[PDB]
Design a protein around this ligand. Structure first.
Ligand SMILES: O=c1c(O)c(-c2ccc(O)cc2O)oc2cc(O)cc(O)c12
Ligand SMILES: O=c1c(O)c(-c2ccc(O)cc2O)oc2cc(O)cc(O)c12
Lengths: 348, 344
């Protein structure tokens, strides 16, 4: 069965064209609508088709049309379709990716093993590249969690997906505080900040890292203040200064506790660079957190810059040094750390 | 610091009156708005105040106004107020309960222990009674999960809360497919059913029981079809008939044999717990026990023993004060549910 629609390509000229697809199968339902898998007839490539029910322009579409990066799911095409009367659906044709960081972590947890640190480095590094890319546009993802990090098992390529929560943060324009997935929600958000920055994604990324080291979510909070209590149980109670920086409008009730040492949080053999990276991502003070490009340059990722590095299956490392000007724009001189001599494109 | 508002009683004649409270503290911010704890002035009772942004009559209010049961958070009063500029907020004054099943289960998990069996019996029994009461009005909760089961640790009383997803189900009137919390979501929902019934709450209850026996969620699915794959890894692949029963309208899932229930749980798991769980977690919605049937299941036999006592030595909470409303799905079951020693 072949379906043909008029669609606009995600990138390039804003010109509609005929696109045809087959082997249409539902791969999930959601609050937004339905997601299908299908095969493009022209190339034969697998794609996902996210069908979203639409007063306002679709923010997810506006954000997605601007993005093209190796560590983000690419919007191939979009097109409109109809459902009841006056119901309009936006259809996003996206790269298909079979696995997630959530499923890989769950596999290891069930086998009572932690993910080898090399995979933790590979996944986190790619996530940081994706964050550096989107943050350059002022776009904050606001839903960083293992479920939204797609993986191709063979190549170990990670791609960030689900821009349904994403927003361009503009200084002085307030934003909703109840926004990320709860275990990954930055403390400023729990304190009711509406003037928060993209650094909320970095906290989320820190939670993912810690999770991949621990074998389970580091802050598995219940509803209410209990999420904040879980955080305090590791970082300790925030000072009044830290509270001010998180939310200058903080409306005054949590327990007073001293920080548990980071080294004691993780398993005894956890590499010290991993703990050091976590401690620089999971800071109460939003401005104290590493930027994504600074995270990529951290010594925890030194192994990925070693010329002799191979994946456990013997297959080639995925692309790690094809940096874009978007990613490098916050600190171009850091490219001498990030891209070692063996990976440097040569003058020829 | 005393606040005074004009509020209508949740139940009773709809006559506004003045209510005063002190010691207001925020205990939570959610998608709906804010939840506070406060102390009623004249009586000194701790209450919760759940402030919901409103617009169209509030479903949750309409539902809570019909309910009065020992295992359900009671709506004492409701009033209106004003965060959002032009926006009206509904305020529900509710029973306050300090703990949740989520927090108690996490406590035992971090200790590498499981909840003692008597508490599994007490909490699951109280859940089933709460479900029997609401189902008798045709009301489906649609968000049964450990977070929504409040616990008083001293009395072992359980109370169901958060009627935010609840709806009166009416045959022939369609309902949304994507509704419970994912780990507790019934398989007909995953298959996009719109003509489902109250039995989706019983599935959820089965997931809660399985979690209390296991020490973790039984089906921790990823997004999409992976949740069904999790279920299939235990119940085995559903048959054509089972699929038709879940949804007689209209996925790639593997053809796997069912895993035996006794192997799913740890070796000294009480066999009556496993038998109860196998009768809740069934593909076919009609094959699941109804809540009243569940309350009467033999796993709860120990609770009907006149010598039963809590481990702290205290007497068990009210278990047998069944009303006509509560018994109405199968009134004859009262000969089991009200033991001779509890009768007049
Ligand atoms: O409905 C409740 C609720 O949504 C919540 C709730 C509280 C905090 C939060 O962050 C989210 C919640 O759903 O708490 C309750 C506490 C009570 O004692 C009684 C209740 O009915 C609730
Ligand atoms: O954005 C995606 C998505 O929301 C989902 C998704 C799928 C099923 C579901 O139940 C919920 C989802 O968010 O899947 C994707 C798969 C891809 O290969 C690429 C994507 O961008 C998505």
């Amino acid at each position: 069965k072949v379906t043909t629609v008029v669609a606009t390509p995600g990138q390039g000229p804003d010109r509609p064209q005929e696109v045809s697809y087959t082997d249409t199968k539902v791969i999930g339902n959601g609050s937004f609508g339905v997601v299908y898998q299908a095969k493009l007839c022209d190339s034969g490539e697998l794609v996902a088709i996210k069908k979203v029910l639409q007063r306002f322009k679709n923010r997810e579409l506006q954000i997605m049309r601007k993005l093209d990066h190796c560590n983000i799911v690419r919007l191939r095409y979009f097109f409109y379709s109809s459902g009841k009367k006056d119901e309009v659906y936006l259809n996003l044709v996206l790269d298909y990716v079979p696995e997630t960081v959530y499923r890989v972590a769950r596999h290891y947890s069930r086998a009572k093993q932690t993910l080898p640190v090399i995979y933790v480095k590979l996944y986190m590094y790619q996530l940081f590249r994706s964050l550096a890319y989107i943050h350059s546009f002022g776009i904050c993802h606001r839903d960083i969690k293992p479920q939204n990090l797609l993986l191709d098992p063979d190549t170990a390529v990670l791609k960030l997906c689900d821009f349904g929560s994403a927003k361009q943060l503009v200084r002085g324009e307030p934003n909703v505080s109840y926004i990320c997935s709860r275990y990954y929600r930055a403390p400023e958000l729990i304190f009711g900040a509406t003037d928060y920055t993209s650094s909320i994604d970095v906290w989320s990324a820190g939670c993912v890292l810690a999770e991949l080291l621990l074998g389970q979510p580091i802050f598995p909070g219940d509803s209410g203040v209990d999420q904040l209590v879980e955080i305090i149980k590791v970082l300790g109670t925030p000072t009044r200064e830290q509270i001010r920086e998180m939310n200058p409008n903080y409306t005054e009730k949590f327990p007073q506790i001293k920080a548990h040492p980071w080294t004691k949080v993780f398993r005894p053999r956890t590499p010290p660079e991993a703990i050091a990276l976590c401690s620089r991502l999971l800071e109460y003070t939003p401005t104290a957190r590493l930027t994504p490009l600074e995270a990529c340059a951290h010594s925890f990722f030194d192994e990925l810059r070693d010329p002799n590095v191979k994946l456990p299956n013997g297959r080639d490392t995925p692309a790690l040094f094809n940096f874009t000007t978007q990613e490098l724009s916050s600190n171009p001189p850091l490219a001498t750390i990030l891209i070692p001599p063996h990976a440097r494109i040569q003058a020829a």
